[PDB]
Symmetry: C2
Subunit: 295 residues, 2 copies
C-alpha cells in the first residue's frame, strides 16, 4: 500500500526500450560509436612513461599532477552529476541509454588519471595534488558554476553547461599531455588522453545536438535569450580559465599557446551548440603540432 | 551579478575529485574491477547461430520467449535509467558512485541485448506485439511501478532493498526460460548472453545488498527492525505478484511449478544478499537439476 499512491500518480505504462525502432538515428550512431570505443586505462602501458617522467622537472611533474587532478574533478562531476542530470529531459529512450554510457565512461576517465598517478607519482605528490584541487579558487569556481546548472531546473542550460564542460573546460588541461607528447614525453599517458578526447569529442557533439533540437522548439525570442546566455556563460568560464591557465603554465612558460588553445576550443564548443565562435579565428592559432597530437 | 552566484555562495565545501589511491571501502574497488573486467556487448555473441533452434521452436515457446525477454528488458530499462541512478546521491564513497555509473550503463547493455536477440530471430510483428504486451500486462507494470515508487522516494535504504530484490529476484521468472531451453540445446547462444547478464546481476545484487547491510546496521534498534519488516513484506508482495506473472507466462507450457520453486530459491538468495534469512523453507526451493545445471 505504501506504493499505491505512486501507482495512482503514474498511470501511464512504463516502457521497455526497443532498439529495433529508433526515433532519432543519431542516438544509435552515438551509442554504437561510444560503446565501440570502450576502453579502460589498464589497456595502456603508462609504466613505459616513467623514464620520461623521471626526467621531467619538479615543476613539470607538479603542473602535470595539477592539470590531471583538475581534469579528474571535471570527469567526477560529469559522471556522477552532469550526464545523470540530462536523463529527465531526454527526447528518446535511446538517448537515456547513451547518457548511462557517458556517465560510466566519465568514471573511467576519472579513474584513468589515478592510474597515471599510481604508476608515476609518489603518494605525497598525489596527496598534494588533490589538496591543491580543493583549494584552487579557479578550479572550484568552474566546478561550481557548472554544478549550479546541473542542480537547477532549466534543461537546456544543463546541456549548455555540459557541452561547455566537455568541449571547452577540459582543454586547459589537455594541452599539457599533448605538448609533452609532441616532444616525446609522457607518450603513453598521451594515448590515454587521446582515448579520453575521442570520447569527449563525441559527448560534446551529441549533447550539443540535443541542445539544438531543444532550443529550436522555442520562439525566435527565447532562442536569442538562450544564445545570449550561452555566450555570456562562455565569456565567464573563459575569463576564469585564463586565470587558472596562467597559474598553471606561467612557470613553465607555455601560457600564451594554451590561451590560443582555449580560444580554439571555446569556438568548437559553441559550434557544438549551434553557434558561431566567440573568438576571431586569428586568435585561435594554437600550435599545429598540438592539434595533430590530438587526432 | 550572476545567475550562479547564489549557488556558489551556498556551497562553500570544495567539490572533490575522485581519488582511487584512497579507497575507504575496498569492496568498491573489488566490484569495480570485476564489473569492468566483465564488460561485454551482445554483438560479440553469435546469436545468428540460434536461428535454427528458434525456427524449430513451438509457437508457445516463441511467444513465452518474446514476452519473458520484453519483461526482462523493461526491468533493465528501469534499473539502468532510474534505479542505479537513484543510488548515487546516497553513496558512502565516491568509488561506490563510480560503480553505480557502471551498473547503469551495463543495465542499458542488458536491455539492448534483448533487442539484438529479437532483431536476429524474430519478426517485426512479433517484436511489436511483445512490447505492446509489456505495456499492457498488469503484473509486469505492477512490479515495475512498485520498484520505481521506491527509486522516486526519499528513503535511501529502501532504494537499495528494491534494487536488490529487482536484481536477485525479479529477473528470475524470466531467466528460467532461456536456462530451460539451453538445457535442450535450444537458443544456446542466447543463453550465453543471459549468462553474461546473470554474471552481472548477481554481482550487482550482492554489492547493493552489501551496501544496504552496512547502512541498516548503523540505525537504531527500532529502525533496524522496521527495515527488516519492510523488506520481508515487500519481498512477499513482489513474490505474490510474480506468481501471477509466472502462471500467465508458463501455464500453457506447463513449466509453472518448477519456475515457482526457482522463484523461492532466488527470493531466499535476494534476502540473504540483504543480510536476512530466507523466507522460504529450503524444501520449497527444489528447483529441477536441469535448471541449476544450465545456470552453471
Ligand atoms: Fe571525461
Ligand atoms: Fe565526456
Ligand atoms: Fe540487467
Ligand atoms: Fe543489474
Amino acid at each position: 500500500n505504501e506504493y499505491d499512491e505512486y501507482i495512482a500518480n503514474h498511470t501511464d505504462p512504463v516502457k521497455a526500450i526497443n532498439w529495433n525502432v529508433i526515433p532519432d538515428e543519431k542516438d544509435l550512431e552515438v551509442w554504437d560509436r561510444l560503446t565501440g570505443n570502450f576502453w579502460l586505462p589498464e589497456k595502456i602501458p603508462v609504466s613505459n612513461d616513467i623514464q620520461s617522467w623521471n626526467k621531467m622537472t619538479p615543476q613539470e611533474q607538479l603542473a602535470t599532477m595539477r592539470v590531471f587532478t583538475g581534469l579528474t574533478l571535471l570527469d567526477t562531476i560529469q559522471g556522477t552529476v552532469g550526464a545523470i542530470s540530462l536523463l529527465p529531459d531526454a527526447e528518446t529512450m535511446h538517448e537515456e541509454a547513451v547518457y548511462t554510457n557517458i556517465a560510466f565512461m566519465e568514471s573511467v576517465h576519472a579513474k584513468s588519471y589515478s592510474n597515471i598517478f599510481m604508476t608515476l607519482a609518489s603518494t605525497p605528490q598525489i596527496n598534494e595534488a588533490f589538496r591543491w584541487s580543493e583549494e584552487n579558487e579557479n578550479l572550484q569556481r568552474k566546478a561550481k558554476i557548472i554544478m549550479s546548472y546541473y542542480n537547477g531546473d532549466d534543461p537546456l542550460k544543463k546541456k549548455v553547461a555540459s557541452t561547455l564542460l566537455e568541449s571547452f573546460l577540459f582543454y586547459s588541461g589537455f594541452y599539457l599531455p599533448m605538448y609533452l607528447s609532441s616532444r616525446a614525453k609522457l607518450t603513453n599517458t598521451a594515448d590515454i588522453i587521446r582515448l579520453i578526447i575521442r570520447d569527449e569529442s563525441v559527448h560534446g557533439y551529441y549533447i550539443g545536438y540535443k541542445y539544438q533540437q531543444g532550443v529550436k522548439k522555442l520562439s525566435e525570442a527565447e532562442q536569442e535569450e538562450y544564445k545570449a546566455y550561452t555566450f555570456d556563460l562562455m565569456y565567464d568560464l573563459y575569463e576564469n580559465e585564463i586565470e587558472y591557465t596562467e597559474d598553471i603554465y606561467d612557470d613553465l612558460g607555455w601560457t600564451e599557446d594554451v590561451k590560443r588553445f582555449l580560444r580554439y576550443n571555446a569556438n568548437k564548443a559553441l559550434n557544438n551548440l549551434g553557434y558561431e565562435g566567440l573568438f576571431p579565428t586569428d586568435e585561435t592559432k594554437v600550435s599545429p603540432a598540438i592539434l595533430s597530437s590530438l587526432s
